[PDB]
Symmetry: D4
Subunit: 205 residues, 8 copies
């Protein structure tokens, strides 16, 4: 698999004149106010991925942010609630046309309680993603080959999953439910940034 | 307080040519598939309320449902997640222009964890609502005077609360957050009806 | 209220030529193998009750047991699961025609989670039963007047509750459900005696 | 093992002129109101099984339902509480002559807390059933061979288990307990359908 | 009530030529290695009590310790597990002839789960002990009158309770059980001092 | 009690040429990044208090901050962990000479688990502080008299408590422990601001 | 390993003229009132064991009970709390000279929380006992060879463990603690039989 | 790896004229008042370690304690909270210049919740430490070779970890936070010895 690694930003958008882009991030942790964005991964849905190393304190990534802002391109995430939050916190732009494979899984794979990406990829595509056990320093100046391949594996399959989940949503007649959930997801991420990250805002208590 | 009690439906909408109506319901319990709708309460925001007794098996209430469907009239609820669900389950129409005082409380009264209607009314209006201790059979053919007065007390103050909460949302710059939450709330209620009532669809686990 | 106190057994069944008898017990505790039966209370549903003091080691009560065995007389309990167990353990006869006001409450009073006798009597009859706070030695040779009146208060109202609950079960169309639950209740009590008292035999886990 | 796969219904009952039939189901999930019935499995207790694919929205299966309604044929389930519920919800007929291997296990295998079918089959028959790890889409138009073999494995052994459990129940003198539990089990399933699925109706709290 | 307050020790044992003495302590807290003994209370079972203030660092109290060591005198405690530990830690002598009203309560008052001294005194003697709400500095050089009266109230009734509990233990045939528990109690307290205070040494896990 | 209310800052430090000042704050909630500082209260330890209303977005309070920065003046807090965090977040200055009455209580009042200010004031001074039940909008442009008196009551007694706690710490020989805890407390508050507010940094897990 | 299997009782005590005998039991479960004794295992501490099959309803085993009653022979158990209870319930004789390897482990192996027999044997003797995974019907008329070998493995090592634990108890100066615990253990088992099996009789709550 | 084993103390400090020494301990358990110190391990950071066996009741180790007291030498621990406590309890000297790799991990490895030494060594150095499964008697007169090698493995890598953690702390600008935590750590250990081992002294509750 060809994986192109960049520092700071894409050189151009020549590879991303497409209707949907798979997006994932890596960070120093789960708390956007403390743990900085370190890597952004992109895929056109083909056998190739782009891995963009983000520098400490970097405030701008014009080509990437241009992609994130383009309303004609659906951004595909797995658990986009986090990625949307960290992207908006880092670059100041909240994507508003999104698809999340975890929400889709929760709306269609009702026969299981395991909705992680590994199980979804195994069941839906019979593709085995091997997830590294040890954790690592994603802020390292030079990423290892194993890190680069792991980071790319998280975006290589989101297009195929989106196609299958759209088929399942049509079959079970939940398309409008999913559309409304995806439409609200950016606001849920913003609520996380504003300080309600531990609160289900719709719960009775 | 004048409380007009009706069977089945409003006689007409002469008292409800207004921009916002306060709405509440009473039922036989928390599970819409098992526990039928028994009472609907309405208020124009003046010192009067309408209390509509709903018959067992009643499928239609044309004047009430006409009010619920009118997109030019905001329906004010406290914890509308439930009322929207039971109304849609009973009459087949989901309101789509709503305001919920509990979400507004969670977005503005950040200095407390008590968001029930009694505490909100006490703090914001210095009005003491006394909530009956014993529970009762809301399906009784004839409601008692105490029941009627209790049922009316749940709608008499929602307009004043909405005004105050709108002031607080403007002050703390959370108007667009609240608008998005209210816009999603009917879908959250529909999700409850479809079988996800115990699931936070946006949670990681 | 006339309360007749007896030692060991009823003198005869002259007061119990009726279709249903209210029954309750008092013991030294919740574990029938350790905590002996001390008092049995009976009512014809009129303003009078019979309170029968049971001696330590007593194995027989022929008139009482004759009443308990009579299939033409429904025995009314509140939470009969316990009373049936202790009666069968003490006298060797398991009643098989029973009505339980707690099961009926759980099948009809779906708008509350409080199913104790005090709350039921308060809501359904507006009768205030005052339940003694201190506990006492029901094995005392001579019961106090306060003890006798408290013991009688537990049977004085079960007939009126049964009538109301039967009305509610008919209204909500749950008569056959209740009948099947009451038909199984003696076996549930026997299961308690055999060693499954802490196990829901129908649960998945 | 010969496994015959059918769409909608058995062609006839020529293979089921027997005293007991093993029954299992597969669905889209644990909630009968949301998750439709997808597969029904049957066995005569011989080395063969029938696997019936049920179509979306299918309301009738006359030969299967005729079998389910025949009071002279005992239906053997493992955890029939669920299967009875989904069968009654889908086809409108509640079987009333049943045997459940999980209740029997809880009444006889008192030396363990593991009552799943795999452990029971391993202990009682020394037969290793391998249970697929990944979950799958039982609503797929064409089931895979692995799915068909897995589905059949759930009914192939219930007759042998019933014979052994009947021996154990006789040995430990619990036959009447089991008979009463099996007699009540269809009502427990109906209670699940009516809205008490999360409630132990016999518990004190 | 006459309460004699002493510093360090009894002047003599003229008032304690008796078969049983009621004993209680007060300390700076629940951890004997950190929280020093501040007060010791004694009663002959008559209407009078002795309250002995213990100085910081005091290692000896010859008359008191002589009383504690006398095998012909039963020491009555309520929850002696603690008092025995703190007494042995402070003065180096573990009493070995003891009676504990809490163990006796747990062995006889099987109809309740509330075994504190206030509830026991209320039920068994109809005597109301009022327990101060605020806590206080028992190490103060001069105890207040309210403190002295509260401290005395903890020993004034233990003789009457012991008499009643002995009657109950005889009635329910648990005398040898209680005797063995009381015989082991000093070792349980020693185990607490040695480092097993949070461990039930007889539990499976 | 004279309570002087100011907007933004003290006019001068003429009343605060002293060795120790009692400090408390009020905010819109428990999360400094979301919930702004609304009120600061100060006391010289005399019968008077200063209540300073802080404006939204206010970044500077030179006289107050001069007081907070003066190393010759001990700042007395109750649960200073929070107040230090919100003060440093709002004005950018972390006090480094502090005394906390809650840590002192935990180090000396070892005979209780209730360390709130109300219980401490009740026990140590026999002064009854009445804490308002309803919560309120501390960001209101004009505070009510009840709010002002409540806010002042939180600082009026900290000097007397500090004197008593210093006596207790000397008596129990814990002065160096307390000094080290107070010396570390500002870093604990900074850790809260940096993102470890839910983590005990010294715990094993 | 020679394992002699008997029905009902030892033929004689020719092999048990010794100072200590290792004892274990097997039953149908953890509840002595429901789950009958099925097997008793004995060892002289040599490489041989005796396995005695106990018949249903058997009330007497004179040679075995003679051994159990002999005060000159210490009975070694692992978790004797259970075995003592089931032996006394079945044959009516409570041994009163016992040693328990689990209590000894809890008193000496303070560096671990795993006190099961497998871990103890592994650590102290470097002997690997393999514990069967599947459970089985110990009431079977004929035990399998695997069952017999497993049952014997539970007694073959208790003598060696007792020797090591006695060395450890002497080294850490806990001999009198252990002696008192072992002296109380039969009463703890009796308390289990009387109805306090779920209660720590010495706990504060 | 050369591991030198000593009884009681180092012969001299010829190998420890260095700026930092890695320190670890082994004991009989987690409670310093009950469980004695058995082994002390030291390393200069080279490929060699010193393992010092401590005798029961040993009160002095002049060369070791001289090393522990030398303010010019940083003592490196992993979870020094425990080691500092046991060292101070045993020899009476509390080190006051320390570095803890667990606190450093919690301050830098924010992308994981696993902070044990094995995971840290695996991630940061790609060195596999194999941790024995069975526990053992560290008080044995003669330690086994496996024990000696295991004990040495706990100190061989702390220097390399300290270097990496110092790099990470500089990179993420947390040096002053770590310095303050390390400065407070000896007082936290002393608090453990004084009786607050189960209390987070800085928590609100």
């Amino acid at each position: 698999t060809e994986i192109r690694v960049h520092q700071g930003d894409l050189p151009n958008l020549d590879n991303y004149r497409i209707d949907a882009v798979a997006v994932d991030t890596e960070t120093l942790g789960l708390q956007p106010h403390r743990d900085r964005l370190c890597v952004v991964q992109l895929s056109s849905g083909d056998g190739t991925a782009d891995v963009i190393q983000i520098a400490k304190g970097q405030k701008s990534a014009p080509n990437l942010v241009r992609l994130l802002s383009d309303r004609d391109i659906t951004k595909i995430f797995h658990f986009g609630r986090f990625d949307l939050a960290i992207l908006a916190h880092t670059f100041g732009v909240m994507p508003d046309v999104v698809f999340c494979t975890k929400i889709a899984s929760k709306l269609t794979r009702t026969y299981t309680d395991r909705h992680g990406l590994k199980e979804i990829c195994g069941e839906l595509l019979n593709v085995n993603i091997s997830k590294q056990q040890q954790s690592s320093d994603w802020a390292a100046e030079t990423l290892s080959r194993a890190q680069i391949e792991y980071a790319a594996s998280d975006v290589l399959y989101l297009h195929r999953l989106k196609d299958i989940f759209e088929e399942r949503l049509k079959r079970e007649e939940r398309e409008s439910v999913a559309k409304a959930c995806f439409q609200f997801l950016p606001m849920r991420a913003n609520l996380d940034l504003l300080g309600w990250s531990e609160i289900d805002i719709f719960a009775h208590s």
